[PDB]
Design a protein around this nucleic acid. Structure first.
Ligand SMILES: [Zn+2]
Lengths: 134, 171, 121, 454, 102, 74, 126
RNA sequence: UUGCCGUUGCUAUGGC
């Protein structure tokens, strides 16, 4: 028929398939270092919270970058904080043990269904798989 | 956390007696919390064993699980197999907390001296003073547990009892 | 067979020297030959490290007979200088001993090194 | 094949993450950040400076004027130098003395100017770790560091103090203790063209200071053994190496984060690599560093390795296994105590207890193509790094320095295409931390200066 | 002794201004001591003490560091023009109260 | 002139039994019922105390030549 | 390591639980199941009605001990070899053997209950 | 050219 401008198909998603087991294997076989903190600087409330998870320190780094980048403190916006801070810290003390989150091992989500087993390079021909190898 | 199945059998009572006495715990909730999340950990590793070799779930979640267990420190570097996650147990998890570790490193004379040092803030891993006893130190924070520099057992100015006794003996 | 027989190769030597350094920090190491034989006849010792290149060799070969008597593992590191540097003192040592402790934060590492040098021996 | 399936599934994973060169290739956020980059100030300190002094094969090597000025101080320990943009040098010893030199009289040996000797008089009257505010050293000064501007020298050692002396008079202007019991300092480095000092203290700690404000900036934690060496350039990065944990870390000090680099050479795979057709083995302790530029550095190990590391690879780029030789084996008249040479030879076990020299000094000239290594093999070695920055290679040797080389650094002279340098190297007969060193083979406690040309 | 570190210094000619982030370092002190910090900032940069300003102070846990947002003006008059009135009430000279009714 | 209230009307702990200082802390109670337990364990088993302390003085408590405390099979 | 007996095997097959997989998801640990020769003698003496149970006890994953006594009384053999050593879990469903085993101390007891195995005197199950 | 001490050079070395 006709085209219709779809930001949901030229928007960077990159999160439906971001699995922590694959990302951990990539960090293992990365062959370039990882920017870890000086060891005491990443625990949070004198140990009343966790250490902090890798996603939490990534998000903290993003927030401080945006913070310094346009000179604005973030706030105590009530609905978003009563959702995200309390639910986040309660699943943090549920699943984050010693700076490592073990929540994923208790979660049904198929690895190979979404994040592996390529869909575009599906190679549904003997000739296409032969040319993809050679 | 969650309570066990038969919470009052005599083996469980002598178990909790030995655990709380050997690790200086305050009540049953420490054992029950760390055993609940250990139950989740090795209930997951059981399923990772019940699936087969060269399964994607088994390969990636297995080496992920044993590497973050090694980095928590309950599993040593050489046993990189997934049946040691099943051999893991509860005192392997609560030997990693900061009270146990302060006593084992010898900054305290017992686990109770370690608990009161931690709650009186004389102990800092790395940069920050940790002040709760159940902290689960990691394999990289294992060697920077030392006395806080803000504390008289470090090198700081002595506390109120020492300075008041010094002042009254100067009077 | 030389006199200083159960020598370790380089990987086992560095594993031994790393746990020696950690025990020296944790006050679980008695260093020197006569302190080692003192703690050996007292029975508080988990394994003894002799260095296989000091200026006599029988000077510490007296210790394998004691270890054999009391069933304690003994292993020969090929550098007294590196052994003293691992011990953390400003001199070479020729023998050192890991004392037994159960309020010890490196018990798993000491047991792993004991198993390695006992399968060597 | 499970690792093949791991690599394959990781490749498919990265392809899928890409899923979720044309004539127009411009990205709005990148060009907006580049507009902010055009707007900002301070393109001064944060040069990611690459290797811009390519002169390794250029200058002469074999005919340096080598003067070994012996001094009467037991076991010299460090060397600090200075150039403005007359040149002074500094030495310090285990006899608790700092000594100022003039070095600018380039064609001859250096000139003594001023002593500053601590002793038993400076032991504090408290034995209490925060009133360590005396004015002299009472134990084992290990390191000196001259300011990049030259107002001060700052020194410290096993008395867990930092004493900052003025240059013109060698007087203690300020004392800063390290406030704890094990706080012995082991290495000091100013960041270049600055007033900021990076000290590496044996608490697995790195302290930072501003010297002209007499203030401490930041304490940063994270090594696992004692931080045996430190190195810095004009950037606010730093590179430290702890001894036995066999890792070298580099620190973004404002961010207080680090990049770790472990070693990882194994004689099993290495002897198999030779077995495809040999006395080389694993690693003891990474000991010394020098940051060559803002993307690479070089580490000196305990088994004689010199390794070259990038900022973008965990494992090292290049190794050099034996860099100063293997030590002379202990004699048959000093191993056994039997009578016959056959049993005294059987007590050497062949080649099993030959230990290599360990590189106890390493100095990369900043941003240059050439670094200098030193141990008690008697001969300093000079190596140049290849222009593709993936290897180095031995140019020549400097064989007039009998003893342990506790410090190497160079002093520049000459213009952009014609240059001459004097390599200072502190020579002792004893390692700069403990004794441990037997077979003192004709050593003397001196300053080995060499004048290299072209 | 407090210690000062400026980072990411950009220039705003539209607001006649130079702005940056301020790592303030006070080992064994309480906190930033903002007027003394404006003094130290006005002497590390040029004079303009009623034209230097800081607003966004966050001290990290355990003390020592605090990140603030520093903006320094030339021309104290145009600093008075461009700064907001609550910060002028906080630091400088302006004081206009709101009419209290209903 | 202010007739202040006192502790028994304030806290209202009406007619309690005498209770335990060790019960006032949940941690010290388990410290002192584990010390009691591992003093009772010396009675039932024979506990490895740590080996020979000094010179071997003797058995210090007696040797029974009639008792055999060993587990027979089936 | 878990000592099995005959009614535990019969109830396992009647409830459709695998032996080693039922043990593994009961204890969340790696189990070694042991058939003594007297339990095997009892399963063989049960006749040709119990062929399915006998050739499910014949399983290479189920290791097997060698009892050295006369007669095939598995309850006596299990009780003796567990009160000798205290390194054994006893998996059983006999009421009398369950009472014997839970009267001797320090011995965990496993039993088919419902549609999976249950364990009682093992104080670290979660 | 130094803590002593030796060869010293009319500057280099080597024993503690
Ligand atoms: Zn039997």
């Amino acid at each position: 028929f006709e085209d219709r401008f779809d930001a949901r198909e030229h928007k960077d998603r990159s999160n439906k398939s971001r699995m922590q087991a694959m990302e951990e294997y990539i960090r293992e076989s990365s062959d370039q270092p990882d920017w870890s903190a000086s060891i005491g600087a990443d625990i949070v409330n004198h140990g009343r919270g966790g250490i902090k998870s890798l996603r939490d320190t990534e998000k903290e780094r993003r927030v401080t970058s945006f913070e310094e980048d346009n000179f604005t403190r973030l706030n105590i916006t009530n609905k978003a904080e009563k959702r995200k801070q309390k639910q986040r810290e309660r699943n943090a003390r549920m699943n984050v043990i010693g700076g490592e989150d073990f929540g994923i091992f208790s979660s049904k989500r198929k690895l190979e269904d979404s994040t592996s087993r390529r869909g575009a390079k599906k190679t549904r021909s003997a000739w296409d798989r032969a040319q993809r190898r050679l | 956390y969650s309570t066990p199945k038969r919470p009052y059998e005599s083996s469980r009572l002598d178990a909790e007696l030995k655990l709380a006495g050997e690790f200086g715990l305050k009540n049953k909730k420490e054992i029950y919390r760390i055993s609940f999340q250990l139950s989740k950990i090795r209930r997951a590793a059981r399923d990772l064993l019940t699936r087969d070799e060269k399964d994607p779930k088994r390969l990636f979640e297995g080496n992920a699980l044993i590497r973050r267990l090694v980095r928590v420190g309950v599993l040593s570097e050489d046993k990189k197999k997934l049946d040691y996650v099943l051999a893991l147990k509860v005192e392997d998890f609560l030997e990693r907390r900061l009270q146990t570790q302060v006593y084992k490193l010898g900054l305290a004379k017992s686990v109770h001296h370690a608990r009161v040092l931690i709650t009186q803030r004389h102990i800092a891993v790395g940069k920050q003073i940790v002040n709760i006893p159940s902290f689960m130190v990691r394999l990289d924070s294992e060697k920077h547990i030392d006395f806080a520099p803000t504390s008289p057992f470090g090198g700081a100015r002595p506390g109120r009892v020492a300075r008041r006794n010094a002042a009254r003996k100067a009077e | 067979n030389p006199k200083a027989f159960p020598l370790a190769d380089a990987a086992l030597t560095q594993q031994i020297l790393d746990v020696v350094q950690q025990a020296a920090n944790l006050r679980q190491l008695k260093k020197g030959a006569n302190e080692a034989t003192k703690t050996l006849n007292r029975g508080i010792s988990e394994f003894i490290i002799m260095a296989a290149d000091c200026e006599p060799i029988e000077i510490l070969l007296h210790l394998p007979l004691l270890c054999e008597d009391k069933n304690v593992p003994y292993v020969f590191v090929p550098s007294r200088v590196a052994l003293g540097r691992a011990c953390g003192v400003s001199r070479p040592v020729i023998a050192a001993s890991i004392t037994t402790n159960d309020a010890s934060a490196i018990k798993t590492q000491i047991y792993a090194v004991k198993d390695k040098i006992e399968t060597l021996l | 094949n499970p690792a093949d399936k791991r690599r394959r599934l990781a490749k498919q994973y990265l392809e899928n993450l890409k899923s979720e060169d044309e004539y127009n290739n411009f990205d709005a956020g990148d060009l907006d950040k580049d507009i902010i980059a055009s707007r900002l100030k301070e393109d001064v300190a944060e040069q990611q400076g690459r290797v811009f002094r390519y002169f390794g094969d250029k200058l002469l090597i074999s005919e340096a004027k080598q003067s070994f000025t012996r001094v009467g101080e037991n076991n010299l320990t460090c060397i600090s130098c200075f150039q403005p943009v007359r040149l002074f040098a500094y030495t310090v010893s285990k006899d608790l003395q700092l000594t100022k030199y003039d070095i600018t009289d380039f064609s001859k040996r250096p000139k003594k100017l001023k002593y500053a000797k601590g002793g038993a008089k400076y032991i504090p009257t408290s034995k209490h770790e925060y009133e360590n505010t005396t004015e002299g050293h009472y134990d084992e000064i290990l390191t000196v560091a001259a300011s990049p501007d030259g107002k001060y020298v700052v020194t410290g050692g096993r008395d867990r103090k930092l004493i900052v002396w003025s240059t013109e008079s060698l007087s203690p202007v300020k004392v800063i203790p390290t406030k704890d019991r094990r706080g012995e300092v082991l290495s000091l480095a100013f960041r270049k063209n600055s007033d900021q000092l990076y000290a590496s203290c044996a608490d697995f700690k790195i302290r930072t200071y501003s010297i002209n404000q007499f203030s401490q900036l930041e304490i940063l934690y994270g090594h696992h053994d004692i931080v045996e060496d430190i190195s810095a350039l004009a950037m606010e990065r730093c590179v430290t190496v702890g001894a036995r944990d066999r890792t070298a870390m580099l620190w973004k000090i404002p961010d207080e984060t680090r990049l770790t680099f472990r070693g990882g050479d194994e004689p099993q795979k290495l002897l198999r690599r030779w077995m495809k057709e040999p006395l080389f083995f694993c690693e003891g302790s990474i000991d010394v560093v020098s940051m060559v530029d803002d993307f690479h550095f070089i580490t000196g190990s305990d088994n004689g390795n010199i390794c070259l590391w990038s900022l973008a690879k965990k494992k090292p780029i290049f190794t050099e296994r034996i860099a100063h030789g293997i030590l002379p084996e202990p004699s048959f008249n000093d191993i056994s105590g039997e009578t016959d040479e056959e049993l005294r030879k059987r007590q050497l076990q062949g080649k099993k207890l030959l230990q290599p020299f360990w590189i106890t000094s390493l100095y990369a000239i900043p941003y240059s193509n050439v670094f200098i290594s030193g141990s008690w093999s008697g001969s300093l070695k000079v190596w140049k790094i290849s222009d593709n920055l993936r290897s180095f290679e031995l140019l020549g040797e400097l064989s007039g320095a009998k003893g342990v080389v506790t410090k190497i650094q160079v002093v520049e002279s000459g213009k952009h295409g014609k240059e001459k340098f004097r390599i200072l190297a502190s020579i002792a007969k004893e390692h700069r931390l403990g004794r441990w060193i037997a077979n003192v083979s004709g050593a003397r406690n001196g300053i080995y200066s060499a004048v290299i040309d072209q | 002794a407090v210690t000062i570190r400026t980072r990411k210094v950009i220039s705003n000619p539209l607001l006649a201004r130079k702005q940056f982030v301020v790592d303030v370092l006070h080992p064994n002190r309480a906190n930033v001591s903002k007027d003394e910090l404006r003094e130290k900032l006005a002497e590390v940069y040029k004079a303009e003490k009623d034209a230097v300003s800081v607003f966004g102070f966050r001290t990290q846990f355990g003390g020592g560091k605090s990140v603030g947002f520093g903006l320094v003006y030339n021309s104290v008059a145009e600093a008075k023009k461009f700064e907001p009135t609550y910060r002028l009430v906080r630091y400088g000279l302006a004081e206009k109260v709101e009419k209290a009714s209903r | 002139g202010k007739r202040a209230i006192n502790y028994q009307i304030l806290k209202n702990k009406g007619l309690t039994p005498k209770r335990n200082k060790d019960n006032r802390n949940s941690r010290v109670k388990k410290r002192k019922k584990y010390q009691k337990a591992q003093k009772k364990l010396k009675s039932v088993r024979a506990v490895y105390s740590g080996g020979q302390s000094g010179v071997y003085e003797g058995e210090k408590t007696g040797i029974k030549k009639g008792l055999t405390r060993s587990v027979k099979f089936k | 390591q878990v000592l099995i007996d005959t009614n535990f095997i019969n109830f396992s097959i009647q409830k459709k639980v695998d032996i080693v997989r039922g043990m593994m998801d009961c204890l969340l640990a790696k189990c070694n199941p042991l058939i003594t020769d007297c339990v095997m003698a009892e399963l063989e003496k049960l006749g040709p009605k119990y062929r399915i149970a006998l050739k499910l006890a014949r399983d290479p994953r189920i290791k097997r001990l060698s009892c050295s006594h006369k007669g095939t009384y598995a309850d006596d053999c299990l009780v003796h070899r567990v009160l000798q050593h205290k390194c054994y879990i006893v998996a059983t469903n006999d009421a009398g053997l369950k009472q014997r085993i839970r009267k001797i101390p320090g011995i965990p007891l496993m039993s088919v209950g419902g549609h999976a195995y249950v364990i009682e005197k093992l104080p670290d199950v979660f």
